[PDB]
């Protein structure tokens, strides 16, 4: 019989086999179910997709066609849920969101 | 010899934004990201298995982990793509 990558049968881009390996190699439990690397690869692909979408949008807004770390930072911090998930993470070369406290302003 | 997630990140980037590309530093960020989330989900699932004196991490654990780790809508879509990936895979 012929080879069908588990990712392909799961209709994913992210590598199911590899994720299964990392699950065994990582000493998370004595045993690893057949669907768990499928589920996990799915979630990892999803989250990746969401981030890439919004960062891509941010790339377009700053009229660039190549996503750099800044566009990722803008995408993470302008989205409430991604920002909560990544509340304690530093995106290298991210910069910060522009923000000036009202009280500091003139007049 | 040194493996990464660049290939898959890039594929997904193309699904989502075919007209967009990505710099090496940024790819590095994304690769960090995938390992950070992998470790969180995996660890939480590990704790779940042990608390219940279970020796095996099944998709049920991944799911519960996700419900704990991801906020709001991110959780809902995660669980969705999750179960539907497991289903499609279960078939063929």
């Amino acid at each position: 019989a012929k080879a069908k990558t588990r990712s392909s049968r799961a209709g994913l881009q992210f590598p199911v086999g590899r994720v299964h390996r990392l699950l065994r190699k990582g000493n998370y439990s004595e045993r690893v179910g057949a669907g768990a690397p499928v589920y996990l690869a799915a979630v990892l692909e999803y989250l990746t997709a969401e981030i890439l979408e919004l960062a891509g949008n941010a790339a377009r807004d700053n009229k660039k066609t190549r996503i750099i770390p800044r566009h990722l930072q803008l995408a993470i911090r302008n989205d409430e849920e991604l920002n909560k998930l990544l509340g304690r993470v530093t995106i290298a070369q991210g910069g910060v969101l522009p923000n000036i406290q009202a009280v500091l302003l003139p007049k | 010899r040194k493996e990464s997630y660049s290939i898959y990140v890039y594929k997904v980037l193309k699904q989502v934004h075919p007209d967009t590309g990505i710099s090496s530093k940024a790819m590095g960020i994304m690769n960090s990201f995938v390992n950070d989330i992998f470790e969180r989900i995996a660890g939480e699932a590990s704790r779940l298995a042990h608390y219940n004196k279970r020796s095996t991490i099944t998709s049920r654990e991944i799911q519960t982990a996700v419900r704990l780790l991801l906020p709001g809508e991110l959780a809902k879509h995660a669980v969705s793509e999750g179960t539907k990936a497991v289903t499609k895979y279960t078939s063929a």
């Binding site: 881009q13 999803y46 997709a49 979408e53 | 809508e73 879509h77």
Partner: peptide
């Protein structure tokens, strides 16, 4: 493919 919060779908 996958459905994002924004409505978009993957490949």
């Amino acid at each position: 493919g996958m459905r994002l919060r924004s409505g978009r779908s993957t490949g």
